[PDB]
Ligand binder design. Structure first.
Ligand SMILES: [Cl-]
Ligand SMILES: [Cl-]
Ligand SMILES: [Cl-]
Lengths: 571, 571, 571
């Protein structure tokens, strides 16, 4: 039931494929005990369901793009899977869900394992003692009803993709296993590897060896009664960069378990309005990215999906991606780490969260913890964001301030951010005035001058100034356009309007003092039921620089041109 | 109207996006002259269509996966596109269709440009003198009715994907332009580049400059009165291989036109049962691949699509891909060329082709000519296949003989293949007995021992022998399975059966004298209305080693293992 | 295989409900022997279909309105039904199809029963000796591909509704049964009932009694060695009329069988330009009706369907319906008989019929024979029509003259009609000029003045003369409109235009010398793939006076008003 670090490198067996399903909008399945998964063999008795003859859905996947009737579906779908597994005595078996949106209730062989809320973070159950011989029955009640107190809350600008959205994996473990570990450079120490290891089980006091063969590193330690051990190691690794995304093969071995990983090393810090990566000043040439596939625009989960998306970001000129608006699948983070993209990773705290609801806060904090705990060894991540645009208020400040201090205590290294409230200093001069800023390492905010705030011309008469000398990071900007839709640059939603907007907006950004990063909104058109223009939007946010079919809009080459200049300037 | 070489390198403007469409099963559109594209604004007259207010389809793409109503649709859809273009006087403008299945009839501003048959080859129309100031109207009537005399014919094991399936591109040329050019190693000569160039237009007698700057080549030639010029260039390029897919930047310039290309150089030849790449004996560790996308299983067209599929082929351990069953989009061939995959490229000729029909022959020969003309500079292509499985009749031999002679006349370097007829030499011993073999450079054939011919263990009881010392290429083998469906290795359509099949089949392949290549069927499950098993096939051929959802079945790793052995053996 | 008379009055058992299906667009089911209906239980064998786990369709019903994917589907669907039946020895069992469009091939328990062409006439197979104990398997291959030589041919102005479109029925008969019978008035004789009865089986020589209690009739005859007997009977029944639709209960009983029927009696003839029902001059206040259902616009088949449509025609003031464009289901003719509607019944012989194809003729003639044989006892039918609008050629006239003489040779009583070619006498004066008229009892034709031929105004300046003194019947007229679409009376497709057209058109009809009937086109909007105006037609012919959703358009009341006047005028 605790998180398991580096699931992919464990003894895994997939449960993915096609599973039997029941759509249950009035939610009578639980009263019916469908989790019992009784095949309706004996028709002399009355039963009013049968997985065995019902329809299939692909797992993993959102359900919305799989059937027209599920396009808008908000409610419960029951999923059922049969599997066999042979577990030698002593060994332990865990069931790992990469993600289920929004609520998951899980049974095995008729017995309730538990419940999970939060649609973008993984969770585990131990089924060691519940596994049986022959056919085991897994039933997952999935629900994506939008709730005011949930995180995200009811309204938000992206499709409500329900389903088992990331792979489902069985993980076999020794009776005492390496559950969690940390291996990174010490804060601001290009010469010191710091880390810890955490065992889980009964034999909690074992010798541990960390092997980094390429660095010729081989340190043995011994865990305490709590199963824990820490270490400092002197060493001078080749430091990871976007241009050379060096990763090291890292091997852990206890007396009962072993696991391999691929980990990179870098320092990251601010220095005035400078972001310094391995002591070198960098610009974050970024683009924002929803977790949505090219071409068919369902929920992304695979390395193929990540590579297509990031290959567009590479052509665009980015060294950086903002993964909005929630923790993405781990394949996305890993692929960016390998290809050489810095990452901004964030939770879906977004607008009118219920700031005074203690359950809401513990949900948000749990997502923050799970996100950081899964990816704390991914050196390409340099910013955690705890919130997008939020309304100013005392209870909002308290909520977000608790999240920020929590993040920094889980990870003393990476920068902490959050969309700050904008203010007008004087006609045509904007700034940022947020008391939360003291707990953040950067000044970051969204702005849509030229799209929501005036026409494209207004970019030419807006300037920015700041009362604190922290690096300025604009995390959203831009405007919409339909690929292949052409007209005057004065006509909204044409490629030509978007192009003119980006030409003027780039000039505005060039005047901003302290600017250290931009992640325009957005890489690729994505589904949103808030966008109603027929034939232009058709329930897509059209602010992509690339169409949902992967076609580069005119504005794409404006930003690419600027990123080339920034690449040369920061070389 | 003639083919244009290297379209992507020209001064191009995309016409892709979403187009207005009219579905017209009874084909009355031509009678009401919908090609006139009259917006129905004056409602005091009777008109019975209106593009302006009708529905959209994405271009490019099959229509089948775009709307449930078009999933099975066979018949006519009308597509309409408005565009503006400012053509400097004297310049010329061409309209390029990457592919349209099956018949395209095209109008511009109400005037018929022409007609094209064949669903997988590009075609052009000059529109220089039909272009208007202001809005231009392009109307395409696309029909995918299956015709007995067509190539392919009514029966085929893949989906009848209709529509404008590859990009639509406007191409601007100077009044006299470089239309076609050939640049490759002379046959079996690592030290001689040979080729030719063909200009189109009035100023046809011109001096041309071919630069390969990295090679320090700068050849100058003058075209004759027909605009043609050939040349021989002494040079020793680094030779393209799957391991080192070296390409050279090649710049052609006329007095008025210029075009750049990326071309590689290699020699390919047979020597007994050996295939020699740059004089080194190689094994073609291949896989077959349909032109169908991952995940949503529409018609593939993009570099994205190609990269995803080829990356699976890379992980499988292949140095070789067979692109079935027709010429694929150009992005697939270019990406295999850049990534290092040898290519087998073929035309949709198979069993029930109308061998006696001269129009069918001319169709098939025209598709062959266009295939070679488009890709003659792609050094990764080493085999042209003119036919899959075909009946053994005098008319078929005559038909395929003429195609084989035609291919060799067009391309003296690459190898020519065609699926040959098998027969039994004695119980448990197979060979091929095909009179066409004299005109082919390899002995190739399909065989499904263990799936169609017996159960998996029949592989253990079958051996092969050949009366001719030519390299043996098995261009299809395998069996079906549904990812996530498990059971006894004796149960068909389980991953276990397919894994057991590949184990024993690999062992059979290891006993075949003269085996030099294999392209199992197939990389990814693909659509086929002949595959009716519910919940297992659901109108997909299931012989992929990868599911249509990117998931590697157990058998994928059996073949991977063997390919890894073959890599080391031939290194 | 012979037709059976009055099927619903027999010992019937329904096979309707939901049947397993396989959509088979490439037609490999036959080669796969899908007609063997082998459940795919033993997965150690390779099979590529499974009825038992496939999807369902409703029978009876077109498939097109049942699934989005089948809306446009033209091709083969396999239907399977399981059933049990205990046939006591000596008794006989027939399988009856009300209609299947277009071609049906039928198997029982793996054995081919036969094949049927023509989508609108019933057909039978005797299954007495092929029935087995336990489960019986009925497999039906249904195909609606449009064929150039078919009847109807490739394009017609109504939807290509495929499937088992009318009920399927098992019929148990005695060893010798009453197969067919005729009971009507002799030609032009209110005082003589003529008839015959036809037995089937070995015991052909039998005594038979024709009981008509309400007439105190009780005639006994004895059949010859061929099972036939004719008879004449003096009687003075009450004569059926639209106003008093009097039907008599009729009972036939043989030594071993008996059947009951409901039959009316009437005389029909022409006298100059007059149509005389029961020697009384009448006007046919008609409306044309396609066999398509209210609200969901599927293929109609039930008494419910017929009653709804006929109730609309009742409200319109009609005493007469044209059932287009083919023989309708039997419920529709019987419900028209009971409610008091004269009927025009026709076969789908239209413009582009292959006049020179002997198979085409045989097909049309079988459909005509089957039409008349089924309904020869329905006294409300007064007109058989052998063609709609057909081109004037010598082969067309030979074709239709044979049908007309075949029709008259089968029915000495009812009138024969056909759409005759119009002609312009002078500017503003039309007539009919057709050599076929010499063989028709009426001058019938279609005319669309004010819709296809001019604006509504043109009706005010068009007049009609006729070279022969036969009753003039306008079998189509009208124009389109969308219910709830309003505008100027000059704007096409508004209710107002259609209202103004009917006002002026009716005033034209009032000027026509010899006019004796009108069946405007049409009662209810109906599906047609020829009708492309978005948001107005959306693949519906909009010429209905009632929307497809049962809503009465303004023009409905214009025609109702005229029909009121005609009702009073013909008292
Ligand atoms: Cl937008
Ligand atoms: Cl298969
Ligand atoms: Cl209409």
């Amino acid at each position: 039931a605790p998180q398991i670090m580096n699931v992919s490198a464990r003894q895994t067996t997939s449960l993915d494929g096609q599973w039997k399903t029941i759509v249950d909008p009035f939610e009578n399945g639980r009263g019916m005990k469908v989790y019992q998964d009784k095949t309706y063999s004996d028709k002399t008795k009355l039963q009013e369901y049968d997985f065995e003859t019902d329809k299939l859905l692909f797992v993993p996947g959102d359900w919305n793009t799989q059937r027209p009737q599920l396009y808008y579906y908000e409610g419960t779908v029951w999923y059922r899977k049969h599997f066999e597994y042979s577990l030698q005595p002593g060994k332990r078996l865990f069931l790992n869900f990469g993600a289920v949106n929004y609520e998951a209730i899980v049974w095995l062989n008729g017995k309730r394992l538990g419940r999970h809320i939060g649609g973008f973070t993984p969770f585990n159950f131990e089924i060691t003692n519940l596994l049986k011989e022959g056919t085991n029955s897994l039933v997952v009640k999935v629900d994506n009803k939008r709730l005011p107190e949930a995180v995200p809350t009811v309204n938000a600008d992206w499709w409500n993709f329900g389903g088992i959205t990331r792979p489902v994996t069985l993980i076999e473990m020794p009776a005492t296993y390496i559950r969690d570990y940390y291996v990174q450079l010490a804060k601001d120490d290009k010469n010191m590897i710091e880390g810890w290891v955490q065992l889980e089980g009964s034999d909690k006091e074992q010798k541990i060896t960390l092997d980094i063969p390429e660095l010729k590193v081989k340190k043995e330690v011994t865990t305490d009664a709590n199963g824990y051990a820490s270490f400092l190691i002197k060493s001078k690794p080749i430091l990871w960069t976007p241009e050379n995304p060096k990763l090291y093969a890292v091997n852990l071995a206890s007396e009962t378990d072993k696991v391999s990983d691929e980990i990179g090393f870098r320092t990251i810090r601010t220095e005035g309005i400078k972001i310094l990566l391995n002591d070198k000043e960098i610009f974050c040439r970024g683009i924002s990215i929803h977790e949505e596939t090219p071409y068919y625009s369902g929920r992304a989960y695979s390395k193929d999906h990540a590579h297509t998306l990031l290959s567009w970001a590479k052509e665009l000129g980015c060294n950086f991606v903002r993964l909005a608006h929630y923790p993405h699948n781990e394949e996305m983070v890993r692929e960016a780490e390998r290809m050489g993209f810095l990452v901004w990773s964030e939770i879906p705290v977004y607008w009118t969260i219920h700031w005074e609801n203690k359950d809401t806060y513990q949900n948000a904090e749990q997502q923050l913890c799970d996100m950081i705990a899964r990816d704390k060894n991914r050196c390409n991540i340099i910013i955690w964001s705890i919130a997008n645009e939020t309304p100013h208020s005392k209870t909002r400040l308290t909520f977000l301030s608790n999240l920020a201090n929590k993040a920094r205590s889980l990870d003393s290294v990476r920068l902490i951010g959050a969309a700050m409230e904008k203010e007008e200093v004087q006609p045509g001069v904007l700034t940022v005035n947020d008391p939360l800023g003291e707990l953040l390492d950067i000044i970051s905010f969204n702005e849509y001058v030229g799209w929501y705030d005036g026409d494209s011309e207004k970019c030419d008469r807006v300037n920015w100034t700041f009362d604190t000398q922290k690096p300025v990071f604009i995390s959203e900007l831009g405007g919409g356009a339909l690929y292949g839709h052409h007209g005057s640059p004065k006509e909204r939603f044409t490629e030509e309007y978007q192009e003119d907007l980006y030409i003027r907006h780039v000039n505005m950004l060039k005047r901003i003092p302290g600017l250290a990063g931009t992640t325009p909104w957005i890489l690729k058109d994505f589904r949103s039921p808030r966008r109603h223009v027929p034939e232009i939007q058709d329930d897509f946010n059209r602010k992509g620089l690339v169409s949902d079919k992967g076609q580069k809009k005119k504005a794409f080459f404006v930003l690419q041109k600027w990123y080339k200049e920034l690449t040369e300037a920061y070389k």
